[PDB]
Amino acid sequence: MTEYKLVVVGAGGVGKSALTIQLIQNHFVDEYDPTIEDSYRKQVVIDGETCLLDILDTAGQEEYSAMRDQYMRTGEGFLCVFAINNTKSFEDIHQYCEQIKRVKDSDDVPMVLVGNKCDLAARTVESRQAQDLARSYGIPYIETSAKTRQGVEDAFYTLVREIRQH
Amino acid sequence: SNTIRVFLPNKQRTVVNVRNGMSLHDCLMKALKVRGLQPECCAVFRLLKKARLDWNTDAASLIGEELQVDFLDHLTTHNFARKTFLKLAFCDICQKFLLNGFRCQTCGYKFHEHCSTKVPTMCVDW
Ligand SMILES: Nc1nc2c(ncn2[C@@H]2O[C@H](COP(=O)(O)OP(=O)(O)NP(=O)(O)O)[C@@H](O)[C@H]2O)c(=O)[nH]1
Ligand SMILES: [Mg+2]
Ligand SMILES: [Zn+2]
Ligand SMILES: [Zn+2]
């Protein structure tokens, strides 16, 4: 099988852990316990091939920001997550991606922009604004909701497809 | 900080938060459960070259330490293979008709391709 070193980044509280745990265990985490570093290995079948996803759940707190430079050179693909009900998280993910391309020293890094918490009706970030940012980086954009599991597999599978070619 | 670095099986790791009075067996339950693991199938060390600890150990007794959780002696990891079931079979997740899907020869788990993420993480019988 093929291994993929996925990394889930984003500001605090956007739903990174809830998205990852939903993918591997189909539970929905409604508690918010902050993450410092969480490693998950789950075997997956994407497009007929057996994939072992080594997903790295990172810390969104600004205290562990020095770890960004570390895992943004190890990971092969990055799931850059924000909360559609949080405009501050949408511009926070703007510099997450810019930081990725700089420490990867590349203009072609596998990334997937992900707007989370789409089950909520109090949206403040339009998809037009998100696809604007995604098209400017040449990366896909996928709206997800860790609660209803909408588009959860789509977002993780799309990043694997981006790494598979590259 | 009240944090403990813990290295989990199948080459995984986490960093748990510690509350005074809370146990070690309870502090690592969530991390072990979301990875398809059970603590009473595992033995927790504390790295020194490792010292075995009892699961009832106070989680405050090892703050700032680095632990590791390993399996007892006498399985893990699936071996998925494309199989097209001629014998009348159904999926093991949605229980609906399964003719063209995947199965792990080691576990015997059979499922559709879109029914892949709901397969248990750990695999038995090696
Ligand atoms: N309604 C709703 N709530 C969500 C969704 N995703 C996460 N949440 C909630 O938002 C909170 C934060 O979730 P969490 O996964 O911990 O976010 P995080 O990005 O991992 N935080 P950190 O960066 O500190 O580790 C939790 O209360 C969780 O239940 C979603 O899609 N919908
Ligand atoms: Mg988290
Ligand atoms: Zn198996
Ligand atoms: Zn099925």
Residue numbers in the entry:
A (entry chain A): 1 to 166
B (entry chain C): 55 to 102, 108 to 133, 136 to 187
What do the authors of the reporting publication say about this deposited model?
Ras interacts with Raf kinase through Raf’s N-terminal Ras-binding (RBD) and cysteine-rich (CRD) domains to drive cell proliferation through the Ras–Raf–MEK–ERK mitogen-activated protein kinase (MAPK) pathway. While the interaction between Ras and Raf-RBD has been well studied, the transformation potential of Raf requires interaction with Ras through both the Raf-RBD and Raf-CRD. The Raf-CRD requires coordination of two zinc ions and has been shown to interact with various phospholipids and supported lipid bilayers in vitro.
We present the 2.8 Å crystal structure of the HRas–CRaf-RBD_CRD complex showing the Ras–Raf interface as a continuous surface on Ras, as seen in the KRas–CRaf-RBD_CRD structure. Our crystal structure of the HRas–CRaf-RBD_CRD is nearly identical to that of the recently published KRas–CRaf-RBD_CRD structure, adding to evidence that the Ras isoforms activate Raf kinase through a common mechanism. The Raf-RBD and CRD interfaces are contiguous surfaces spanning Ras residues 23 through 48, including the C-terminal end of the Ras helix α1, switch I, β2 and loop 3. The Raf-RBD interacts with Ras at switch I and the N-terminal portion of β2 (residues 27–41), as previously described, and the short linker connecting the Raf-RBD and Raf-CRD (residues 133–137) is partially disordered in our structure, with poor electron density for residues 134–136. The Raf-CRD interaction involves hydrogen bonds and hydrophobic contacts with C-terminal residues in Ras α1 (residues L23-N26) and β2, extending to loop 3 in the interswitch region (residues K42-G48), with direct and allosteric connections to α5. The Raf-CRD interface involves residues near the C-terminal end of the CRD in the stretch from F172 to T182, and nearby N-terminal residues H139, F141, R143, as well as F163. This interface includes the helix adjacent to the first Zn2+-binding site and extends toward the C-terminus, where the second Zn2+ ion is coordinated by residues C184 as well as by the interface residue H139, linking the N and C-terminal ends of the Raf-CRD. The position of the CRD observed in our crystal structure is as recently reported and consistent with published NMR chemical shift perturbation (CSP) data, and with Ras N26G and V45E mutations shown to disrupt the Ras–Raf-CRD interaction.
